[PDB]
Amino acid sequence: WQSARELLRDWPSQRHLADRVQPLRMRLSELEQRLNNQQNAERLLSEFCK
Amino acid sequence: WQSARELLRDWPSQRHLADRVQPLRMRLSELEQRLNNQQNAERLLSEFCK
Amino acid sequence: LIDRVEEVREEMDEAQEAARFLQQHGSALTKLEPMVAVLQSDPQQHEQL
């Protein structure tokens, strides 16, 4: 009974947050593109510094 | 009884999504700066191209 | 130096695992949710009750 209660407690949260995978997917795609640009900018900054 | 079950179904989702506020706030700020830069670039383009 | 990509990736791991569990046991949980109360009453425990 207690395990079932805990499972039914978590499950709606699981359903609630499952849909966010795709919004998260584009989020990380954009974030990692941003990080690539940041790494490129840092590399080029150091490149010129000398 | 049905309303109570619906309410206690909402409570899981309610707390989980309410936890999302602050991360979304910084996202909103970033997106606002993005829009501001968009308008700045568009304006500058217009003035030059005139 | 946001480095949030790691955090977002952890969120994806958790959320995709949640979706996989939904696929794995969605029907079972749906069948359990309307008659959960029975688990509190075990036949012999009904007599002891």
- Directed axis angle between helix B2-18 and helix A2-18, to 10°? 60
Structure tokens at A32: 């990692």
**CB-CB contact of A28 with C5 (8 Å):** yes
How far is the alpha carbon of C1 from chain A, nearest alpha carbon, in Å? 9
How far is the alpha carbon of C8 from chain A, nearest alpha carbon, in Å? 6
Residue found under tokens 């899981």: B12
Among residues A16, A11, B14, A17, the alpha carbon closest in space to that of C36 is found at A11
Residue to substitute from A17, A19, A33, interface B, most B β-carbons within 10 A = A17
Residues of chain B positioned with their CB less than 8 A from the CB of A35: none
Structure tokens at B6: 């619906």
Contact (CB<8Å) A12/B17:
no
Rg of chain C over Cα atoms, rounded to whole angstroms, equals 20
Instruction: Please state, in angstroms and as integers, the Cα–Cα distance from residue B46 to each residue in B40, B42, C12, following that order.
Output: 10, 6, 42
Q: Give dist(CA C5, CA A42) in Å, integer.
A: 18
CB-based burial of residue C31 (10 Å sphere; 0-12 exposed, 13-18 middle, 19+ buried)? Answer: exposed
**CB-CB contact of C30 with A2 (8 Å):** no
Sort residue B16 into left (φ over 0), alpha (ψ -120 to 50) or beta.
Answer: alpha
Return the SS3 of C1.
Answer: coil
Residues of chain A positioned with their CB less than 8 A from the CB of B17: 16
Sort residue B27 into left (φ over 0), alpha (ψ -120 to 50) or beta.
Answer: alpha
Q: Give dist(CA A16, CA A14) in Å, integer.
A: 5
**CB-CB contact of A17 with C14 (8 Å):** yes
Structure tokens at C33: 């949710």
**Looking at this protein, which amino acid is placed at residue C40?**
Q
